[PDB]
Amino acid sequence: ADVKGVCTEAGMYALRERRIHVTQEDFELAVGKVMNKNQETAISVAKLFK
Amino acid sequence: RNNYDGDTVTFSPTGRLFQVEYALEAIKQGSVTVGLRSNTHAVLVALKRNADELSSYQKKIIKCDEHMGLSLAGLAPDARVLSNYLRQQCNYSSLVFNRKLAVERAGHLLCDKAQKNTQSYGGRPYGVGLLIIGYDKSGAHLLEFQPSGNVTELYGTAIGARSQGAKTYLERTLDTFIKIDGNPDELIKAGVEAISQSLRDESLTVDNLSIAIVGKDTPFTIYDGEAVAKYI
Amino acid sequence: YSFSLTTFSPSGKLGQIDYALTAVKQGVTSLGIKATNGVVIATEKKSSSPLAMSETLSKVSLLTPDIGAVYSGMGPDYRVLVDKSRKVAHTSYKRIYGEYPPTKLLVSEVAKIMQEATQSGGVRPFGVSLLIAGHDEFNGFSLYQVDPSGSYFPWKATAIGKGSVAAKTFLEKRWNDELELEDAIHIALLTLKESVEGEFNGDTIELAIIGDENPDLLGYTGIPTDKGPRFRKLTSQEINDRLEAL
Amino acid sequence: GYDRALSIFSPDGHIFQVEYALEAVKRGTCAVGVKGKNCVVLGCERRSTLKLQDTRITPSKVSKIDSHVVLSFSGLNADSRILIEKARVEAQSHRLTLEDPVTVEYLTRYVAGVQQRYTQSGGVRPFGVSTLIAGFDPRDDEPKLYQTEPSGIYSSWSAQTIGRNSKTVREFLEKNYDRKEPPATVEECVKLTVRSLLEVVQTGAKNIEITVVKPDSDIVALSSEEINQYVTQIEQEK
Amino acid sequence: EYDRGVSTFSPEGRLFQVEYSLEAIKLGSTAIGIATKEGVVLGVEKRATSPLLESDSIEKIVEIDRHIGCAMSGLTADARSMIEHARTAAVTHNLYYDEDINVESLTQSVCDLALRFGEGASGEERLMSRPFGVALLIAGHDADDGYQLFHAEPSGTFYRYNAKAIGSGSEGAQAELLNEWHSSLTLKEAELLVLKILKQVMEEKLDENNAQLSCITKQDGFKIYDNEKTAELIKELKEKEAAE
Amino acid sequence: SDPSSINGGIVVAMTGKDCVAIACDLRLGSQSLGVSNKFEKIFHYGHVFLGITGLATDVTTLNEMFRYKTNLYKLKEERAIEPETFTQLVSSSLYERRFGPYFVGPVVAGINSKSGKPFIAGFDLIGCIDEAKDFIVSGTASDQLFGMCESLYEPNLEPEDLFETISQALLNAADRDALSGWGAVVYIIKKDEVVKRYLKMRQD
Amino acid sequence: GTGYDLSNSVFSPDGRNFQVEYAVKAVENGTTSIGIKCNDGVVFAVEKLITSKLLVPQKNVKIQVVDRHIGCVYSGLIPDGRHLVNRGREEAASFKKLYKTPIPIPAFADRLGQYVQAHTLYNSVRPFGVSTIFGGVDKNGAHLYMLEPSGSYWGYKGAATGKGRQSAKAELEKLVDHHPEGLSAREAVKQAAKIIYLAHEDNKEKDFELEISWCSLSETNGLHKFVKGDLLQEAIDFAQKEIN
Amino acid sequence: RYDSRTTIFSPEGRLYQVEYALESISHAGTAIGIMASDGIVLAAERKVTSTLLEQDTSTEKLYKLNDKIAVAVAGLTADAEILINTARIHAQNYLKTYNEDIPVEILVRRLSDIKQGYTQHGGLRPFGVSFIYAGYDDRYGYQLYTSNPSGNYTGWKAISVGANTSAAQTLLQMDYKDDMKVDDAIELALKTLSKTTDSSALTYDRLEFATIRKGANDGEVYQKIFKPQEIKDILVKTGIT
Amino acid sequence: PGRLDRKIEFPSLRDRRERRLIFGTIASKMSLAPEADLDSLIIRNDSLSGAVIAAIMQEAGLRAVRKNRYVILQSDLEEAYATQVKTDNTVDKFDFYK
Amino acid sequence: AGYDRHITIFSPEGRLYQVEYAFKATNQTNINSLAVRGKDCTVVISQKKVPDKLLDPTTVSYIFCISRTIGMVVNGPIPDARNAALRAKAEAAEFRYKYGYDMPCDVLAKRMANLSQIYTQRAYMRPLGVILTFVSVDEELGPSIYKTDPAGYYVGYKATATGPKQQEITTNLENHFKKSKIDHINEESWEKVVEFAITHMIDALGTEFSKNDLEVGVATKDKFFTLSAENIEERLVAIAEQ
Secondary structure (H helix, E strand, O other), X not given: OHHHHHHHHHHHHHXXXXXXXXXXXXXXXXXXXXXXXXXXXXXXXXXXXX | OOOOOOOOOOOOOOOOOHHHHHHHHHXXXXXXXXXXXXXXXXXXXXXXXXXXOOEOOOOOEEEEEOOEEEEEEEOHHHHHHHHHHHHHHXXXXXXXXXXXXXXXXXXXXXXXHHHHHHHEOOOOOOOEEEEEEEEEOOEEEEEEEOOOOXXXXXXXXXXXOOOXXXXXXXXXXXXXXXXXXXXXXXXXXXHHHHHHHHOOOOOOOOOOEEEEEEEOOOOOEEEOHHHOOOOO | OOOOOOOOOOOOOOHHHHHHHHHHHOOOOEEXXXXXXXXXXXXXXXXXXXXXXXXXXXXXEEEEOOEEEXXXXXXXXXXXXXXXXXXXXXXXXXXXXXXXXXXHHHHHHHHHHHHHHHHOOOOOOOOOEEEEEEOOOOOOOEEEEEXXXXXXXXXXXXXXXXXXXXXXXXXXXXXXXXOOHHHHHHHHHHHHHHHOOOOOXXXXXXXXXEOOOOHHHOOOOOOOOOOOOOEEEOOHHHHHHHHHOO | OOOOOOOOXXXXXXXXXXXXXXXXXXXXXXXXXXXXXXXXXXXXXXXXXXXXXXXXXXXXXXXEEEOOEEEEEEEOHHHHHHHHHHHHXXXXXXXXXXXXXXXXXXXXXXXXXXXXXHHHOOOEOOOXXXXXXXXXXXXXOXXXXXXEOOOOOEEEEOEEEEOOOHHHHHHHHHHHOXXXXXXXXXXXXXXXXXXXXXXXXXXXXXXXXXXXXXXOOEEXXXXXXXXXXXXXXXXXXX | OOOOOOOOOOOOOOOHHHHOOHHHHHHOOOEEEEEOOOOXXXXXXXXXXXXXXXXXXXXXXXXXXXXXXXXXXXXXXXXXXXXXXXXXXXXXHHHHHOOOOOXXXXXXXXXXXXXOOOOOOOOOOOOOOOOOOEEEEEEEEEOOOEEEEEEEXXXXXXXXXXXXXXOOOHHHHHHHHHHOOOOOOOHHHHHHHHHHHHHHOXXXXXXXXXXXXXXXXXXXXEXXXXXXXXXXXXXXXXXXXXXX | OOXXXXXXXXXXXXXXXXXXXXXXXXXXXXXOEEOOXXXXXXXXXXXXXXXXXXXXXXXXXXXXXXXXXXXXXXXXXXXXXXXXXXXXXXXXXXXXXXXXXXXXEEEEEEEOOOOOOEEEEEOOOOOOOEOOOOEXXXXXOHHHHHHHHHHHOOOOOOHHHHHHHHHHHHHHHHXXXXXXXXXXXXXXXXXXXXXXXXXXXXXX | OOOOOOOOOOOOOOOOOHHHHHHHHHXXXXXXXXXXXXXXXXXXXXXXXXXXXOEOOOOOOOEEXXXXXXXXXXXXXXXXXXXXXXXXXXXXXXXXXXXXXXXXXHHHXXXXXXXXXXXOOOXXXXXXXXXXXXXXXXXXXXXXXXXXXXXXXXXXXXXXXXXXXXXXXXXXXXXXXXXXXXXXOOHHHHHHHHHHHHHHHHOOOOOEEEEEEEEEOOOOOOOEEEEOOHHHHHHHXXXXXXXX | OOOOXXXXXXOOOOOHHHHHHHHHHHHOOOEEEEEEEOEEEEEEEOOOOXXXXXXXXXXXXXXXXXXXXXXEEEEOHHHHHXXXXXXXXXXXXXXHHHOOOOOHHHHXXXXXXXXXXXXXXXXXXXXXXXXXXXXXXXXXXXXXXXXXXXXXXXXXXXXXXXXXXXXXXXXXXXXXXXXXXXHHHHHHXXXXXXXXXXXXXXXXXXXXXXXXXXXXXXXXXXXXXXXXXXXXXXXXXXXXX | OOOOOOXXXXXXXXXXXXXXXXXXXXXXOOOOOOOOOOOOOOOOOOOOOOHHXXXXXXXXXXXXXXXXXXXXXXXXXXXXXXXXXXXXXXXXXXXXXX | OOOOOOOOOOOOOOOOHHHHOOOOOOOOOOOOEEEEXXXXXXXXXXXXOOOOOOEOHHXXXXXXXXXXXXXEEEEOOHHHHHHHHHHHHHHHHHHHHHHOOOOOHHHHHHHHHHHHHHHHHOOOOOOXXXXXXXXXXXXXXXXXXXXXXXXXXXXXXXXXXXXXXXXXXXXXXXXXXXXXXXXXXXXXXXXXXXXXXXXXXXXXXXXXXXXOOEEEEEEEOOEEEEOOHHHHHHHHHHHHOO
């Protein structure tokens, strides 16, 4: 479910940008956000602490 | 509600402990016993129960000491602890002060014993009430013990199953037995009358009656059987 | 499941440990950066009223002269546990080893006090994750994070508290394998100014180092053969200096 | 029902914690005891979990507590392990007191004793282990077989089976066995044990393990080869 | 609530939890004791759940002295602790007075361990954490009261009896004892009486593997019978009922 | 005899330039009975050597006790204890039981792998740091050794000259010590390696 | 509401401990206890209800003495108030051994308040449910406190608790108005009785017995003693005269 | 329902708390021992990592309990920490009393009791630690065991605990050789660790290694923990890097 | 989906930036005085919502008309804030998790 | 939903609901305290609210003498007030004979605060609902005010206030220190520093005070005494007169 939402976020960053082309910098931000958010469901780096 | 039983350590909203009242109930369900006194004697007369007619009744008077004694009404395991505790104190008094234990000081020690279970988590307030008599240096006394731990001096009282009938007898005949002194037979006879009235759907048997007596020149003596057959 | 220290979960772990972790995240932001001749440790102070004295809060407390600490998590838990930490350090490892203990060893004692406060049910573990940095003559400058889960980890640069997640990428980006202490002190303030703005100033940000031996702090002289405190707390005036040149 | 806790009794009068303790026994390997007249044989299923499991250093299901009493178990393997060690400190201690080796009758009481104690209390769970204790007395040469159960109740049986489909072996045993004449030759008695154990393994001759106690502090563990010959006699006749 | 407590009273004034323990006593095997003026005869039923069960190396009549015996039913587990304590009490009495222990007095000691339920209650320091699921028929002879039979109840205290049945078959056994008892009995009569009542309240066949008598006869001491003795009395019984 | 040293034994530790040595006699005695010719006084844990003089039962007991204490350290820090640190460890073990106390006189010897610097120490019954780096002697010939050592002592001898100096001191002393006289083992200790050389000497 | 009782250390969201408030409600059902402090003394009077007319009269007291100079009367449960006075006698006695003087009234106030507070602080005890009015005379003159089951205390010129606190606080409120001066202990004996008589219209179902005690510096030599005989009868006549 | 304290059983004679404690294990990284007659390799994987987690200064999933027995850890490292201290203290107690470095069996059996003990008695939590015990004792030679958190033990020729227990076990037994080499045993551990672990490249820094050998110089027993650079080189040889 | 794709949350805990903005914009539509400090009511309580900012100002002019005054003083502002300050425990001023 | 019926069991936000309901029990006597620093004194003035006329007012207090140089002002309830006061006294005693010198304001406040943490650490006691503020002039720190909270959090202060109407007190104080540009009051005898605390409290609350309605404790250099109602009265007409 993560990977269809990466594409939704990138295309909304790309709207702000106002280009036919979708740059890869938008796909750098989309991953950094989906990834950060799932580490808050794990309450920090709890795998490390167990 | 009734979710304020289940703990003896929680006060209810009304400010009762349900647990101590439920101890008062356990008494009614066991046997009846009657206390009464004069000024020269204190006498206890108790209805003894059996479970079947091969069973030979159950003793409900325990001699505490030769100038003290008690009856029980309610649970029998609860009774054993208190009659044992009470004896420690009477022996202590003989060993340390060479002195007969005073009924009133006895009762407040018993009060204490009870309040120990009441504060504590764990344990129960005792499921038995005792009617305590003695004759000390200040003559005869009779106390009424409760699960709450209240000891109250009375000329006559009764606790247990259908005890209103005995308390009714007692009320009417309060002054008659107070004024009689010197005749041990009459106080014995009067207590007999009270416990007859307490009964409903039963009759007196020679092995129902138990007579317990202490006086001015009467040692503690426990009568049963053919000793309560002069005064049946 | 989640909700006793005693109960294991279907996928395991105790939940009280996870909830204590949550507490840390509601904390203030403390962060450490290892340089090649130091460790700088930094945190901020808040107190609500401005009528509060800020120099009375303890949050940069030396455990030993060799080893400083900060926290993120519960304020009360800190003072008690700093107190306990010190006490254990002399009993097990200054009456025996004959000097103030190793950075690695002392971090293990701290974890062991936590661990006892997890084993005994109805007794919560400490609200704090500390950063404990120190120096020893064997393993050099060192930095650790000791979690309220009673486990400790060694680290190169790390941050903990509410603002941790924002700070860590700054740390990834800005850390280099060879740094001096003075480039670390400036990187430390810079990152910590992300955590808050409108109130950041040299008298309300508390920052210290565990750097080089200072005989200035030793307080007795004419003994060359021992070293002086590695620890140095920088005053309010120093913190302002560094904030102007940045 | 009243499994929320151990100390509370039950309208039904059965402490649930003990009943479930029994249920746990069925998890573990089958063990069977059969007495002779000059032997007791104590055999157990030695169930192999994987082929990477050593036979070099891996524990046998049968443990000697002392040098003439033998013990097998069925149950929670974790739990058995401290039960066997506790049994043993006392057992040896029996000689400290009396300067007599351990009597089988004193020993069953003791093993039932540690167990009874755990049940009586509330701040421990019972052992989930029923044991068979086989042996002879030091003084005498009549074969003795005992059982302990979780509950803290002990019995003597002529032959008895516990763990892993115990019922089916129990019935098997009744039909084969004779109480008028128990087998008076060590070999034939062994053979009865092997036949039982065959059933629960379904197929194996490397997963049947036989141990024997004989009088005068003879305890031996049987060769894997020696058991296969007995299996050979049982497959041919069938 | 009242029943899932352990020192929690119900609105009728019954400690429910403790009430429930009486049904533990009953689950076990029937034992019927009958006191006589010649001695007390104690019989049991012993269950065989297999032919393979050695019913004759297990017992539920036990020796406590040389003139005190005890029958039991309930948890043999709790019978081990109850019987062990009682054995200690007899022996320590013997230590202290070099004199016979009275039947009743051994019973007071067995009821003291029973009192203990608690974890906060006062009287004696509570160390035992639940009721005992086990009863006793206590038999002995002192010479200053004669042969006596008392019944220990772990949920109550000591009751004097001329006869009691405890176990599964207790309720129906008790009627028969209300019907047939006498003070005109000899021990010989008394033995065939335990057996005549026992069989009717038995569901297993009346045989010697599932039975076992013992007596307290002061003269002979505590004596557990033979299997050969018990088999005789089964025959004598069979002869009697055919005649009858 | 005396109650803290019936069973004798002697240990002598010196400093040379970036080397230590330590040596001991091998006689065990019990009153006037010479019991065993082989029985070492000196034991080692990692690269630190220790002799323990005194009542013979406590030498053996602390040998075991110190091994337990050292090895707990080594495994946990992942590195050897140093002979500076190790000094204060003896001092606490001895002082724990001030009342009913160990009857020993241990003498450390050793060379740091972080300075390359010889460290010797002495302790009494309930322990003390005696932090001279002159030379340190203990045993029943304590009196005898302090003088013999002093006479010979020049600081900063070469290792092989140091072997001459300590072996000679020990041998003269031993003949004239009642509770030691048999055998000798001399440790010549360097950073790189540790050479153990038994003497050949007279028996009594 | 619901929740945060069932425990006696659990805070409510309002900021309270519910169960501790329910304590005060039990004290309200208890019989009326008042103290009137006087200028050279204190007077304690109490309303002792008659269970039935079979009670022995003037032989049961809710007044108890502490050391030899400190009066205490409790309202609430009768035995709880007893239990709290016994602890108090031991504490007054330890003070007395230690320093070789009788207690100050402020001293006792501190000590008692710690023992009530101790049972509100822990999870395995039920907090007390009694108020106890106490006081006496010392060097520093007369003093009166009333200790609530919450473990709260202050000095009072005059204090009332029990079923009759509604009437009693009002009568005392007139008493300060009519006498801000102090009122002698003698005239307060006669006063003590009237106050109870009007507070007995809150427990009108039953009959009562009036017991007065006092402790006065100059008419009792600093010592507590029961008021009886002629002093006690005069107070009865006073209360009877003005009630009609 | 029965997911509470430890005295209580489930009516199926299951203590839920031992069952859950097992499941704790596969939320910390894979840990593998493979036994060979030339030596035992112990190999382990890190539960998680970041680019500024220091892990080249210390081990923390390979502890020496003594000088001939060492352990790999999988599971909660907090639970592990107390049990490692208790094991190690006992290891030296045995040394003091008998003058022999503790047998592998006595040490596993001790710790099996201790784990069991925290479940059986009181209100204390069970432990959720799997230790692969790899030892030498001069009785049985080379020895591998592993202990459950349940508080029992079994001897092995190969075992895998930690995350991905089923797969890691399967690949191990597929290519296992009865006599093996020490060198091959190291190779088979990297081969398995690659496919089980969801890290893209298998880096030296995600590995800890120790080997216990008597064949690296006989007469003596040598415990060789691999340093980062030794680990880093052996990946090259097997061509993962 | 096809119906709602956006599930735009609306919180009640908010932050210090957005409490400050809602206050100055409500205080740009009605009178003020120089003594009336609005940036000291976003720190005392911390779980305030937008409707309650419309309660606070309304009630500010109800203290102001009690006096009979045309402007809103710091005495008016504080009294009206203490009414409907909210009892919430999700606040920070009573904390120690810092 | 679990998580104030227990002392130790956390919420899913990492807060302890029960511990915070103690920060909210300090309103139960509904008094306000102010303590400020002068330049040779520390002043604490808190309400004395004597509600009833059946009470004698001179035993009503919240200011406790802890030690020769140490007072403590209580906001919150009486039962816990007394427990706080004995422990601080008990510790004051312990410190002097063990370590052979007087007890500073820090040393006491830190020790009580750690003690509060212990009481929250176990589930075998509860937190108390009382806020403690210690007042002293310290031997080398001079004027010191340390507030010890129910969790065990402490921070020092120039000025602190406590109670229901504390917020109203807090703005008045802030404006004073802002304008003055010092962390002190420069009045050079304690009789006018006391007047200053009365002055700010009348304005904040909007209430007059009288002799019975105030309590004033004064920490002076090397000595401590709590002022009678008639000395407070002298102060009160000093305010009124300028």
